[PDB]
Design a protein around this ligand. Structure first.
Ligand code: FE
Ligand code: FE
Lengths: 125, 762, 762, 125
């Protein structure tokens, strides 16, 4: 009758997700700006071990930690307990992109990924 | 940047004295030799706060040098029909009909049904090319004739497709017809769907014998060599009732065929009923019956999902064993793998004086090393120690080659920190076709993986592996206990959950005490029965984990190396199709153990409560700890002391996953609650079930479910059960050079259970 | 504080022209007269920010005065067996055997099985008294003889009980044996249970004719004059296979009966197979077969839970229709109620000129007033308007007499504020047995209430009622649309979801457009088919709500006023029994529409997304807004404006519950997404399903699933489907005296749908 | 063999929940003291309408709102839109216990419940 070619139709929820993510990115950069102490809080104890994250630090974590895996950061163990790097997930069959610097501990690399995910969003605004 | 250059696997997880285990290796290219050696595993956690990696070389008939070769792995699931005499390449006119449900319609060339040699472009194939169904024939000259559909396939919509080669009219024909009902397709009857068409094209070549096997869900790559036809251009989605006629069909017949009629049955050359074989025990076979009565039987390869919703499924019955006529579909995935099908490089037969234990074949090749872990049992029908440690091999299969952190959006949210991955997680991602998926990942077409096989290199099985949740995970994590046992002089035996499922309670009963791994998440119903029977009649258990006995699992009776499991819910955003909950290997419902009235509390005393991985907590003692009846458990443990502050797994003896005491779920009435865990962040999460409905505050530090309970209860005949209810329990054993409360507590219980005297009553 | 003094109900929800509806009223004391009049309901919300309450008085034959009597209401479920010939009261020896499963063993005196007159203390009863099973017989002089159990009952353990009266030995005997298996009881075979005993006591009296009916799960109150045996001392739990023997059984006979053997079958006087009647369409009946062949058939009363796990249920089959021999149990609850069984006070035959619309009988009696709402249809087989409003009567039943804020601990957390209740709620808590429970409350047992009756006073049905989620709910909230329709002068008929279920799509096809209420959560399968078939062929719909068509529901074929629904998960912490998911009234699986490949998206365009009740949000226009294909939807609305910022339900047009666009769940491809909602707090929650596995931040403002989507799609032959996807949409219609975007949009669509031209295509 | 009388076996998860409620009550009172601004924040807008509760106020709500029903408070509409009272839930078949003061709007009554709930946890310490 009327619905013929599947390529004439797009998942129109992407319109919403693009707006939510834009509105939601601004919400995160503003939280960082008005509570700059959380960057120190994270660098001192990125695991929250025995000092749980603050509510505003947790709110930031909740956005970064739930992003799509493609283009996402993980930490790559080059030599465990000596050298860690920041990997970027690329398509299946590809190797990750490795950041240049090496970090000596897991905690140090976690904070580097935190700082970079923040710089990445500032760029998109 | 580092390159894993070689990998291997064995044919079975466990071997007893006198039995034979076969090893398979594949180097990145065929050159040089590799060294093989037998080692006993002891400790895999290189964490510098702990005792570091430990192994021991054992002299074995298998050590030596071996030619290193690359072994091609056949990837993706499909159906294969042998046809040496070219019966399914009729010399005259012929027609092909089937029902279709494409999940990746636009994912390049995919073969639906073929008897086709792609090197010579000979034979016939029905394929998706450019998002359209195409019927093609070839003569082996490189020229082909194609008829291309007018309407591109809609994703997850059921179609009836009829391909016709008509040499009289020198004409190819294709009949595409959408057969969507209220319940079988992505969308319903509301949408006005114009996706039907009848197209004809000129036939300018004869169809030639392709000298390949007939395939469903793929195309033959080249002329079969030694009988192996390689399958390429894997199709994703379902196929239902594919059949081949020895004549050309017309508009009329394709009409009747799309409604379910079996037109001109006398003229069927072959007809595959994927539902033939379904019984009350399910369909635990790869066999595919040729319902036409012609003997052209097929065989499932790489375990496509059986017991699947068909084109005619209307939703009145959801259990395939009670309505096979509506479950005639196979669900194919390009990333299925039940067997690498390599050629063995060497083998090993357990000699007499080899202790039951954790073992691996260590492989050195250039500047890489690989470990092929397996397990040795005592001589059949005997025990060689008073303690038995169950290797959680069902759970190893469930997490086999997990790639959560690469595929699950919320993977890091669940972890509570950016995950730390290693060389093994990079290899899985570059060469998925060598390794396959776990039950925690999704198939490429967004459906949960419900089968997992031991006959493949399982990378997170290697002891030096570290997992994204924060430290180590399964087999490496269990080596924490294996190190504590060997360090304290305890003599123990080892058996896999696969062996428990084989031998039943008869195995457990040969031991005074049976120890659990760090995470026995997956168990068979027979395993539940064996634990229950053993404990009910004087056995003694130590549940040193959490999230144990959570998922019901079945061992493929035809392929003991495959395990099946179907889950309602997973970390990856994969769908759980509506009518496909029942297991194809036994027909039972499966799923959560709690859902079948066998909650873990009913057998081990505590059951799943929550999970979270940013770090672990410690146990604060409860009133029952100062009960004189359990003074034997609380030996050199002061009542004011924290239990398990510090550890190699999140820094505490209680975390990662937490089980709890719950009478309503089956905790024995006479259970004592010795201690509960604290210091859990909001990262710790509760799974919504009938006991806790979702609401704000359903997380650590805010809901009373989020804790771990240390319990003990006695049974008849001097039996008893002890649960620590935390995955990270075994991670704290080695803390402070083995001088900690978690060591003293576990030792206290273990020394009491191995005593020739009844576990303390109550 | 103040006292509700009168309440009533009616026998059915809707009457067409010429048909009769009966009314039933009960005052606190039999004294005086009450007044009744007919009213057309218009607006119920008294919110001063809104247009206030509005009704219209209608002259009717029923208006007048009536004697005000108190009607005692028979509460609790049970089985009644008429025995006017004293056949089940032997004058010699006799024995009683049954399997029981007590869920409130300590909750006072409970009759398991009896033919007993409590007033005279005559007959015989098997009862739980002070937590122990007790067999008693009386002669009517007040004296009785009892044998009491040595072992008190364990909660939710299956027992075999045999009570014996042996006159030749002047002896009473009681045999108690536990029959727990891996799967039928609270705990399993590990606990060393010892709840077996065989006791005897002296029998000093003979058992006399009680002149009452034999009962299962209760005791006869007194001599059954009028043929009605009032049932008291109700039992909570299961009974399986109760039977009476005409001789004195011994130890070995109780032993054999406990293993399921039907000892000495010919000696049976009666033997009730609760599973007899189970077929492929379920067991949709209150009838109970007498498997002894003696004609003592029973009748279920107040709808106990049929299709329930039996004593021999082992978990191999979970659908009762496929294994009747293991579903021979009935689950009884002291607070069941399928029919107040009052005496009618007055009726009403719908006169000719009475418009189809929302109606109610207004009752005045002292310092109180009560409304008995019902619905008037047009003459059978006709339509009297172009617009049809579907009254969500199936959902009204699901929420009937809800006491969430009194029973659910997390009730306030889900509400996002302390709840504001009223006299109608205070009354439900004080006189529970006049009203019964909703499917959201748990039975006192802790099992979800799975049956709800229209033949009771449903207090939250009254128009002036305010509900604890923050404003108004279901029927009163639906009057928000009734007022808006009347204020704009639209002409409309009305029908119930019960009528839709009966007439099918033939009913919808009489209307250019069909409007939904504010929350059509509950629907039959036939209703879904009716909408789907109606929209597929030119029907035009307005889904002005959210969470619609979420739960599959069924109407009892014998009792059209009863509705059955079985939920996997609910607010109150009621356990969903493992093997009892299939509906007794049709044997189908039921449950979530989404789980049967029939998600709300497949039919109305959007589906359940999230819920939260602290307050509502507003819609911001999306890129499809400025599309010309929907210029008509947007005509009077500025592209920059918010939509629905303000309203009577939470202060916003998008709140309470939100449905979303989703292709994977069945949204038609040609759907346009006009606006989404914002300003949802952490109070808004997400039900974890296979696309949303639980993790931190799965709440409003932190997860992209928490929003409502305003959608539209065209269908074949000039049809079309408009959806707003928010429960609180209708609450924003009257904002700022009907001058706002929510009114403009709804009017634009409605005006377009009732035109004599096809709804705009896409 | 051993498990005989059901009254000899109490539900020992009550020992945990008692310890949890104590630690959790202290946590709340010390949240109210460390962030006294949240008491005013609730008074001004208890529904959080257009000004969602701050993270620290929500943590207090998360405790109060999930408490067992028996003995808990709701808001009784004595005269709707004119007089509201603080009701205390008692056993089935019982009237709620009613507070003395009447409130003009639900917003005021909701903050009255908030303050009284704080006063109640203080008294248990
Ligand atoms: Fe898991
Ligand atoms: Fe609901």
């Amino acid at each position: 009758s009327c619905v013929r070619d599947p390529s004439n139709y797009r998942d129109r929820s992407a319109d919403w997700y693009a707006f939510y993510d834009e509105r939601r990115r601004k919400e995160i950069i503003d939280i960082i700006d008005e509570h700059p102490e959380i960057v120190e809080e994270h660098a001192a104890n990125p695991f929250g071990y025995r000092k749980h994250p603050s509510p505003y630090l947790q709110r930031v974590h909740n956005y970064f930690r739930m992003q799509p895996t493609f283009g996402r950061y993980y930490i790559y163990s080059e030599r465990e307990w000596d050298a860690y790097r920041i990997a970027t997930i690329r398509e299946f069959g590809e190797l990750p992109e490795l950041g240049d610097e090496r970090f000596k501990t897991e905690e140090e690399a976690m904070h580097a990924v935190f700082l970079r995910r923040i710089e990445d969003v500032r760029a998109e605004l | 940047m580092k390159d894993i250059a070689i990998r291997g696997y064995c044919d079975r997880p466990s071997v007893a004295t006198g039995e034979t285990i076969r090893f398979y290796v594949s180097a990145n290219e065929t050159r040089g030799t590799f060294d093989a050696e037998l080692v006993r595993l002891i400790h895999g956690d290189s964490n510098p706060a702990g005792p570091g990696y430990k192994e021991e070389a054992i002299k074995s008939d298998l050590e030596g040098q071996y030619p290193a070769r690359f072994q091609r792995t056949q990837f993706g699931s499909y159906v294969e029909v042998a046809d040496p005499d070219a019966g399914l390449q009729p010399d005259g006119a012929f027609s092909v009909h089937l029902f279709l449900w494409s999940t990746t319609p636009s994912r390049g060339r995919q073969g639906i049904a073929s008897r086709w040699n792609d090197e010579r472009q000979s034979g016939w194939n029905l394929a998706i090319e450019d998002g359209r169904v195409v019927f093609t024939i070839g003569d082996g000259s490189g020229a082909t004739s194609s008829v291309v559909s007018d309407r591109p396939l809609f994703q997850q919509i059921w179609y009836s497709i009829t391909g016709v080669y008509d040499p009289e009219k020198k004409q190819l024909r294709l009949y595409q017809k959408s057969v969507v009902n209220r319940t079988n397709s992505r969308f319903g009857l509301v949408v006005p769907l114009d996706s039907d068409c009848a197209v004809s094209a000129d036939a300018t070549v004869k169809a030639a014998d392709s000298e390949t096997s007939l395939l469903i869900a793929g195309l033959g790559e080249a002329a079969a060599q030694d009988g192996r036809t390689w399958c390429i251009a894997h199709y994703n989605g379902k196929v239902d009732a594919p059949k081949i006629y020895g004549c050309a069909l017309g508009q009329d017949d394709a009409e009747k065929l799309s409604r379910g009629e079996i037109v001109r049955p006398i003229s069927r050359l072959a007809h595959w009923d994927f539902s033939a074989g379904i019984g009350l025990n399910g369909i635990p076979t790869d066999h595919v019956v040729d319902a036409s009565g012609y003997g052209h039987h097929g065989r499932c390869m790489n375990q496509p999902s059986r017991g699947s919703t068909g084109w005619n499924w209307d939703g009145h019955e959801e259990n395939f064993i009670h309505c096979p006529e509506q479950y005639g579909a196979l669900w194919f995935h390009e990333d299925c793998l039940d067997d690498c099908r390599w050629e063995k490089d060497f083998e090993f037969t357990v000699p007499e004086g080899l202790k039951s234990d954790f073992y691996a074949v260590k492989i050195r090749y250039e500047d890489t090393e690989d470990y092929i872990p397996f397990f040795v049992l005592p001589p059949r029908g005997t025990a060689t120690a008073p303690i038995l440690v169950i290797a959680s091999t069902l759970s190893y299969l469930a997490y086999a080659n997990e790639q959560i952190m690469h595929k699950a959006d919320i993977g890091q949210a669940v972890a509570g920190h950016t995950p730390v991955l290693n060389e093994n997680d990079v290899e899985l991602h570059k060469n998925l076709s060598y390794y396959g998926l776990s039950t925690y990942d999704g198939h490429i077409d967004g459906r949960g993986v419900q089968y997992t096989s031991w006959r493949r290199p399982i990378m997170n099985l290697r002891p030096k592996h570290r997992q994204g949740f924060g430290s180590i995970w399964e087999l490496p994590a269990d080596l924490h206990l294996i190190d504590w046992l060997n360090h304290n002089g305890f003599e123990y035996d080892v058996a896999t959950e696969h062996d428990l499922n084989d031998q039943g309670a008869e195995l457990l009963r040969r031991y005074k005490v049976v120890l659990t791994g760090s995470h026995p998440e997956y168990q068979t119903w027979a395993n539940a029965d064996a634990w229950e029977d053993y404990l009910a009649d004087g056995g003694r258990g130590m549940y040193l984990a959490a999230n144990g006995m959570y998922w019901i699992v079945e061992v493929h009776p035809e392929k003991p190396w495959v395990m099946e499991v179907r889950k309602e819910l997973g970390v990856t955003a994969w769908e759980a199709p509506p009518g496909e909950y029942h297991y194809s290997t036994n027909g039972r419902r499966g799923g959560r153990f709690r859902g079948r009235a066998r909650a873990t509390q009913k057998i081990w005393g505590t059951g799943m409560s929550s999970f979270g991985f940013d770090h672990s907590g410690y146990f604060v003692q409860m009133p029952d700890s100062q009960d004189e009846r359990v003074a034997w458990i609380m030996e050199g443990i002061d009542p004011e002391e924290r239990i398990g502050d510090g550890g190699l797994v999140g820094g505490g003896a209680g975390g990662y996953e937490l089980d709890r005491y719950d009478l309503a779920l089956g905790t024995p009435p006479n259970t004592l609650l010795l201690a509960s865990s604290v210091e859990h962040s909001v990262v710790y999460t509760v799974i919504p079930d009938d006991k806790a409905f979702p609401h704000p505050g359903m997380n650590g530090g805010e809901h009373p479910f989020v804790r771990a309970d240390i319990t003990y209860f006695s049974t008849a005949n001097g039996g008893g059960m002890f649960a620590t209810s935390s995955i990270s329990w075994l991670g704290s054993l080695s803390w402070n050079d083995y001088d900690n409360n978690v060591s003293k507590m576990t030792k206290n219980v273990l020394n009491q259970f191995i005593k020739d005297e009844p576990a303390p009553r109550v």
